[PDB]
Design a protein around this ligand. Sequence first.
Ligand SMILES: OC[C@H]1O[C@@](CO)(O[C@H]2O[C@H](CO)[C@@H](O)[C@H](O)[C@H]2O)[C@@H](O)[C@@H]1O
Ligand SMILES: [Mg+2]
Length: 581
Amino acid sequence: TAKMAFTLADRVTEEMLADKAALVVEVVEENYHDAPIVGIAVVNEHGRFFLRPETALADPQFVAWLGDETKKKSMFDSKRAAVALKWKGIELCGVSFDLLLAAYLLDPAQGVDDVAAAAKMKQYEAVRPDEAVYGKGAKRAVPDEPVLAEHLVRKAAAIWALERPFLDELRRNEQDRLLVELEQPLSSILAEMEFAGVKVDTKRLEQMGEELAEQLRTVEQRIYELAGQEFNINSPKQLGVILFEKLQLPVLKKSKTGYSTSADVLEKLAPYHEIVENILHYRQLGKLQSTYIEGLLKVVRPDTKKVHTIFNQALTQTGRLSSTEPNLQNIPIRLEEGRKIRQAFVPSESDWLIFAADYSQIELRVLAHIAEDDNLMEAFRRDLDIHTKTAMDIFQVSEDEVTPNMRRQAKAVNFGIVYGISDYGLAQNLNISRKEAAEFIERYFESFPGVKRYMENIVQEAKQKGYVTTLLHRRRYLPDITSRNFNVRSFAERMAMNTPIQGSAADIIKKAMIDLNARLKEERLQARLLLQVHDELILEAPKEEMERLCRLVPEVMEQAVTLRVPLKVDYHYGSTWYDAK
DNA sequence: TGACTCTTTT
DNA sequence: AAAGAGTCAG
Ligand SMILES: OC[C@H]1O[C@@](CO)(O[C@H]2O[C@H](CO)[C@@H](O)[C@H](O)[C@H]2O)[C@@H](O)[C@@H]1O
Ligand SMILES: [Mg+2]
């Protein structure tokens, strides 16, 4: 392939500082926090340019251009560059188009994760995949300057050529505003959150780990006694031999590889031998120790004593965020021993507090809205306990006739409706038969005929159109909706049902984040957004701001969109994330 | 290195 | 429904 033409500049010139350009600020490290920038490419009306970062980032004019909002840039994964630049004390402004976010909105199923993959969607192939240039795994490395510069320039040239086709298709999809007014402003907001980080009380985590280590050694030794020998408890294969061969415990569930030792299998095995509950206890403690004490500690920055997560804004099929290093969206809450981990997440400044606000049943409320189910809407308009009310309806009983087991099962039905699990999935969850599960679902549709109507209609719409959409026009293609394989087709149907629910909830929280950031600034508060956990926002703020935030945050969240039923937000604050409960 | 298995969250 | 730790082939 002949090299694409470009100037390998030694110095920044005026013609590199046009008010419209494709810009590449290359951070090759997967985790971009305080990570090197290996090179820079600019493409504009005047030409193609490669700049060495030590030159560019020391040039007052270039830096000024980077921070000038009126100088428009087109990029791929602008958040990566923005954050890497934040660590160097440089502001990136004026990013008017992000090809990563554009490709993501166009079809999240494509898994677009480099410029090449995005370009391929429009039959543009004059750019290499990053993996071919940098290698992968242990072989991963930055190549020599000629190879590096050409690659960065080809990526920039691709972005420059692809902006128009991508924007055009977004417009046809009615997704132009979704990109420009939602995902892109959110991206700046996430960059600030990641950069700010969350303070961690490492000392408390460490002493927790010490306590766990003691309890782990105790249970582990007890396990060896009950087995009559030592083995690797964390090896499902070895444990399977102890349980199902040495101890002759029944085999209720198997895997592709051998015996299942899932927690739900073990729970059923407990009455047979004393070893089982000890194994369950071991795995609980071991999960906390390895994943949440040791894992968290590994990624706390020693300089700051903070964790700086990375939100992947371009991954999920539903439009949710995910987060990594650490993942702050699965910190334990359910069981008290796990929940205590949240005590280690503290405010980053003295006399500040953690403030958390969460939507109450936002997914079921969205469902009531999109389905226009009279019963479901009435229930939310009365702010009823939705699980108790669902139990009342399914079992045809009065509120005081609802037993705890009845409510538990109604709750599992709702969870099934919300996440679109199979009737086989409901059966598994409630430990009942499919016939019984199917009866539950059938009773539900009798009490909520509008939801049944919605399930039917959306599946048909997915068939006819080839995709489903959310409130704010996020899209998900479902080509498997026509499949002749039952399991493949059924999963697609469930995704047709679930996506406008989970996706629209994602849309709403994302808008609330944008609305909140603007309100905080207007109100001149020092409060800052730290985390989003699917349906909740977590902030830290001076204690003197708590009373104002108690009024402000739920109002912004509740008013983010207007639905046929109210949105409800609960809130708490305290000296640690644990206490904000 | 990657397929597997298991566990945590919403 | 949909990140990461550990094990065990290759
Ligand atoms: O920068 C986040 C952004 O990068 C992508 C690849 O383009 O993911 C990379 O970065 C993530 C966080 O460090 C990694 O988890 C991921 O494995 C890595 O490829 C995008 O998927 C993401 O939106
Ligand atoms: Mg909640």
